[PDB]
């Protein structure tokens, strides 16, 4: 299920993915299993696109904050004045 998204304005977005899948349908007849095989492809497409849609949210928070946090651990504010003042926590922490 090869993908090649190429957005580039103000930050390159060269998104590429796929979905290596292998199913095994039974061949009875042409028109009988034709739509069945297409249905398998269809569901893998719908499912993977759905998975990617969910991946937007899960990566949006999980992957993001996992690599670069959104807010700090306290999530409040970073005041470097008080941070440099007294050596704000390297004493015990």
């Amino acid at each position: 299920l090869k993908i090649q998204v190429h957005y580039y304005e103000d930050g390159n977005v060269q998104l590429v993915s796929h979905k290596d899948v292998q199913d095994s349908v039974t061949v009875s007849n042409e028109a009988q299993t034709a739509k069945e095989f297409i249905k398998i492809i269809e569901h893998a497409e719908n499912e993977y696109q759905t998975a990617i849609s969910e991946n937007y949210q899960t990566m949006s928070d999980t992957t993001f904050k996992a690599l670069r946090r959104q807010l700090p651990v306290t999530r409040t504010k970073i005041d470097w004045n008080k941070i440099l003042s007294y050596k704000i926590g390297k004493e015990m922490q």
């Binding site: 651990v73 306290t74 999530r75 409040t76 008080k82 003042s85 007294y86 050596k87 704000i88 926590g89 004493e91 015990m92 922490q93």
Partner: protein, 370 residues
């Protein structure tokens, strides 16, 4: 000169005071204000009408003692100065404000008018040149050595479950519902009203608090132990008489976890702390589930923390590492933690100097306290 600083722990029920470096605040007495009752005509009595310590404990029912700090709200400012003066006296400090630095304590959500009012005291009436004031929870962290812990104090009318991480209490997660054993003992006086006894005098109520701190505990089973018939243990009256106890010793502290008994829309310390847990990093919660920092004087009951453990079990899910870290010298743990903090040398900056206070006062504090 920055002499030996004085770690002054302003605990809700009991205020503590002593020089840093020490392990015991040699000058302690509870947090009260004692004015007399009668009029001494003949001599042989003390003078001043503000009797603290051995005078107060001596002339308990002779003095109509009162309490300034009301859930962290103190109003006897002038008399507070006299209390400090009583400590400043030959009895306790024997020194001057200018001579020795002062490490005073605080609680969250306090009105800056009162905080800066205290600065007016120690910089105008008293003239402390090196005064720094801060929370007591961090002091308890110095005592435990832990840095990522949820501190909940237990005084007489103050209970703030503050979750701290590496010495950085998340204000969005800080919980301050300062109410404790004050009204619990008052409700126990209501039990005595439902037994025929009044303790309307503070000293009369002091005995109630003495037995409260003495003959009370936490029956982990709330309604199970509540519905069972008590034995009504006859406890000695100070004169020499004796009176029963009943469920009160465990029934009255149920109000701490069940605030609806007094009719208060609260949730019980444990749930409030779980709410503080909810406002943090999920992974840090597991540490904090095991980083149970106990603090305050009211953490002295049988099955206290264990009933609290049952609360956590009703709150926390499975496979959650729970670990109580109870201290022993609870109120002094914060005092010794202040002795640790005041011993720091980088510590000289954020304390408002006398000239610093002369500069702006209010905003100089605002910016130096934040």
């Amino acid at each position: 000169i920055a002499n030996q600083p004085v770690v002054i722990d302003n605990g809700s029920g009991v205020i503590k005071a002593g020089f840093a470096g020490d392990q015991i605040p040699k000058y302690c007495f509870p947090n009260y204000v004692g004015r007399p009752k009668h009029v001494r005509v003949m001599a042989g009595a003390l003078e001043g009408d503000i009797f603290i310590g051995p005078k107060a404990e001596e002339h308990r029912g002779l003095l109509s003692i009162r309490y300034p700090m009301e859930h962290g709200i103190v109003k006897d400012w002038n008399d507070m100065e006299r209390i400090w003066q009583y400590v400043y006296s030959k009895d306790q400090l024997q020194t001057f404000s200018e001579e020795h630095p002062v490490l005073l304590t605080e609680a969250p959500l306090n009105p800056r008018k009162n905080r800066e009012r205290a600065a007016e005291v120690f910089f105008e009436t008293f003239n402390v040149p090196a005064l720094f004031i801060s929370m007591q929870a961090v002091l308890s962290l110095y005592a435990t050595g832990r840095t990522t812990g949820v501190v909940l104090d237990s005084g007489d009318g103050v209970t703030h479950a503050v979750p701290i991480y590496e010495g950085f209490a998340m204000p969005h997660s800080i919980m301050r519902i300062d109410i404790a054993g004050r009204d619990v003992s008052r409700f126990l006086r209501l039990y005595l009203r439902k037994e025929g006894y009044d303790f309307h005098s503070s000293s009369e109520f002091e005995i109630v608090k003495a037995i409260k701190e003495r003959a009370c505990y936490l029956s982990i089973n709330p309604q199970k132990d509540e519905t069972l018939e008590t034995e009504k243990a006859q406890y000695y009256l100070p004169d020499g008489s004796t009176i029963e106890i009943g469920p009160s010793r465990f029934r009255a502290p149920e109000l701490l976890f069940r605030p609806d008994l007094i009719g208060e829309e609260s949730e019980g310390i444990h749930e409030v702390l779980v709410f503080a847990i909810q406002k943090s990093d999920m992974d840090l919660r597991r540490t904090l589930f095991s980083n149970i920092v106990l603090s305050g004087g009211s953490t002295l009951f049988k099955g206290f923390g264990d009933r609290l453990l049952s609360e956590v079990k009703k709150l926390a899910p499975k496979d959650v590492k729970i670990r109580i870290s109870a201290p022993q010298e609870r109120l002094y743990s914060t005092w010794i933690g202040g002795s640790i903090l005041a011993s720091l040398d980088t510590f000289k900056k954020m304390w408002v100097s006398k000239k610093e206070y002369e500069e702006d006062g209010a905003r100089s504090i605002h910016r130096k306290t934040f």
